[PDB]
Design a protein around this ligand. Sequence first.
Ligand SMILES: Cc1cc2nc3c(=O)[nH]c(=O)nc-3n(C[C@H](O)[C@H](O)[C@H](O)COP(=O)(O)OP(=O)(O)OC[C@H]3O[C@@H](n4cnc5c(N)ncnc54)[C@H](O)[C@@H]3O)c2cc1C
Ligand SMILES: Nc1ccn([C@@H]2O[C@H](COP(=O)(O)OP(=O)(O)O)[C@@H](O)[C@H]2O)c(=O)n1
Ligand SMILES: [Mn+2]
Ligand SMILES: [Mn+2]
Length: 554
Amino acid sequence: SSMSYSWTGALITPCGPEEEKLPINPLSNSLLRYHNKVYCTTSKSASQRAKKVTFDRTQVLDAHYDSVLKDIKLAASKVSARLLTLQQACQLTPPHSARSKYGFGAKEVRSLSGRAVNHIKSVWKDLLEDPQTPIPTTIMAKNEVFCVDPAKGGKKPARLIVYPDLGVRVCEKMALYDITQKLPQAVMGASYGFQYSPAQRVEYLLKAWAEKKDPMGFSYDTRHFDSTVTERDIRTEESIYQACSLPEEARTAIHSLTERLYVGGPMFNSKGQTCGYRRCRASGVLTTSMGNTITCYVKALAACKAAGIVAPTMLVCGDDLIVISESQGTEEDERNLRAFTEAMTRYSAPPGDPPRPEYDLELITSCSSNVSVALGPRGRRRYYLTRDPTTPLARAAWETVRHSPINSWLGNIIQYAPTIWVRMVLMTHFFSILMVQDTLDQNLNFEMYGSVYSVNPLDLPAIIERLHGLDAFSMHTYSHHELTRVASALRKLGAPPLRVWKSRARAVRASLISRGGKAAVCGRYLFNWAVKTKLKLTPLPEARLLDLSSWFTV
Ligand SMILES: Cc1cc2nc3c(=O)[nH]c(=O)nc-3n(C[C@H](O)[C@H](O)[C@H](O)COP(=O)(O)OP(=O)(O)OC[C@H]3O[C@@H](n4cnc5c(N)ncnc54)[C@H](O)[C@@H]3O)c2cc1C
Ligand SMILES: Nc1ccn([C@@H]2O[C@H](COP(=O)(O)OP(=O)(O)O)[C@@H](O)[C@H]2O)c(=O)n1
Ligand SMILES: [Mn+2]
Ligand SMILES: [Mn+2]
């Protein structure tokens, strides 16, 4: 049937400046040496990604899909959702959100400036009066940092991002924000990812594994997921939304947004030249994350029925997917997974790498993370969530006139506190830098799922205990897999071995213990691993006061 994109041949031009690296990276050049391997994706590679995501889609559904969609619309029916006030949608736009063509930006929108509320009023009225005229969109290449992989063809091309004008984006939040806060949870229940903190997600998968008599799990990621969603997928999304109890005014704007924006439309480059036509998901609309996860859940759930997966348990984060199920014998389990893949290829959610049955929780990698195990001095098994540290290290090295890696470090220290690589590398380099800057007690921004939370470095012990528990300061023996990987990534980026980090840490700890106060608590908790006569860590009362609920949610 339809083509994901078509192109006029106009270039995908840069939105602002794409910065050169500098000849000295003074904050991260004592972290790793091979700064030549750290690169940022750029609009240069945008045509390359363009050719990789343009393809003819052929969707073929069936009674399994049809059965799922029916039950998911019924779950949807139990949701009641309201319009947001224009004023509320305004106050939800980020403080740096891309300006409007109509001469005003995030600052006026957040401050309810009259100019802005006026234009946005008339944009809302156009949505309610006009259900057909396509809404134009800007296409830009995403800039993100990676390490090179010669085994994966040098550098990844930039991801394609496609978003409507700032006026339209506020309007989306009025029509759809409340649903984005209620629908996913309701139709997916505990299967919704994006409601679990790292430890909660380990808890969940651990539980799923043990419920099964003979457990078996696999993970799935659709290849170029935004380009695989078809105009029918998007219209089916509208009907899942319309399944809820909504005011009539919202249904009207929801329908207009779907027909005029979500099912597709013309894309213009940043220079204003008309650039192509889009017939798939624009990664940029409000519903990007919700549509990804619900359309992924429905297809994946259908495919489970097609493949005869027994007693499935799912975890769905966008297009990343984990399924813990009852094993039917390894021979059947392989056949079933080909069936699952053939099904989802029929649903137009074809895979990146072919999925594969695994019978060991550490061998299932999804959401770029995996569960792993460490002992204590206890001998007791502590389970946690880790990842390949390559990309975290690469972004620990991204350092230009306009970006500081220091937020990147904090973010990983918070999210992966129990990992050997956070504990021995990032935590050490973090506090070492801040002390030399005399910055320990000056706040940083932690960033996750759009929200930005303020964090004081000297609070990391309490924060980490509230998130991961006191076991995060006691992991004695890490797994052969984890040791191998962290070792290899450190070699790959020219960072010191773990041996050397242990020495550095001993010194860091000594140095902030002897600042007393909150700084010393940091050294006794965060660096208990570096001294041979470990002190007995006690729970921290201030952790009992922290409420980190909304940190790892949506
Ligand atoms: C709803 C949502 C909104 C986000 N908004 C921002 C933002 O405004 N500014 C910012 O700097 N980072 C944003 N991010 C990125 C986010 O903060 C994490 O960095 C990201 O999820 C990578 O963490 P991960 O463990 O899930 O790794 P990953 O394996 O990279 O993510 C797993 C899945 O989450 C989804 N996803 C990944 N990145 C994004 C993304 N940028 N936007 C939407 N979905 C994504 C995808 O479906 C992906 O398959 C957002 C992520 C989500 C899920
Ligand atoms: N920076 C990002 C990353 C992913 N996503 C969404 O998540 C989907 C799948 O995530 P992904 O990491 O597997 O990237 P793809 O190569 O599948 O496009 C995208 O296709 C996007 O719709 C986004 O909106 N912004
Ligand atoms: Mn994908
Ligand atoms: Mn993915």
